Amino acid sequence: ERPKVRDQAGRMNYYWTLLKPGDTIIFEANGNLIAPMYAFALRRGFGSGIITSNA
């Protein structure tokens, strides 16, 4: 039991990994897996970056 945040006493821990070209990922579980629907095949850029701007 934990302090309610966003009106939820439960927690939700978001994990990630990069899956390499031709590599398999295996999801094995008997409870509490919040499985993917969608994933993202990356294209590496240069000159990009995150900025915080009110303009």
Partner: protein, 160 residues
């Protein structure tokens, strides 16, 4: 200044000199007016163009630099990042403010030197056939035309 011509032996610059940074005033019987010394003006412009190029082209353009993220148990690597950014910006502002004050004084010394190199060049041509009067001005002994006055400008007039 350092060489003692700019605000030195010549009291002030002429607003009738606009064509070049160095030049001559006419005071002959053929009337007044100004004729610029293109050799002292152009060698000063070449030195100024190369120092203007140098100060700009040494500064190789800044690529994308963005803020980096740190959680509540990453305050050390946040303060290490901040110390790196602040310490580089201290050095960078310091090198920029060193260069601007030093090279503005060296530019004043360089231009003040170019007035010496011109004045002593005209004194060594004129010799006895004109004497110094108006601390920059030369009174011609025998007197001569605007052609003879032009001949002093272009690097001739080898009269004793």
């Amino acid at each position: 200044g350092l060489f003692g011509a700019i605000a030195g032996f010549i009291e002030g610059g002429w607003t009738g000199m606009i064509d070049g940074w160095y030049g001559y005033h006419h005071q002959n019987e053929q009337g007044s007016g100004y004729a610029a010394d293109q050799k002292s003006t152009q060698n000063a412009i070449n030195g100024i163009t190369n120092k203007v190029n140098s100060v700009i082209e040494k500064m190789n353009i800044q690529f994308t630099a963005v803020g980096k993220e740190f959680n509540k148990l990453e305050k050390r690597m946040e303060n290490l990042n901040n110390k790196v950014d602040d310490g580089f910006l201290d050095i960078w502002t310091y090198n920029a403010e060193l260069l601007v004050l030093l090279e503005n004084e060296r530019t004043l010394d360089f231009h003040d030197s170019n007035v010496k190199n011109l004045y002593e060049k005209v004194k060594s041509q004129l010799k006895n056939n004109a004497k110094e009067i108006g601390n920059g001005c030369f009174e011609f002994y025998h007197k001569c035309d605007n052609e003879c006055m032009e001949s002093v400008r272009n690097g001739t007039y080898d009269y004793p």
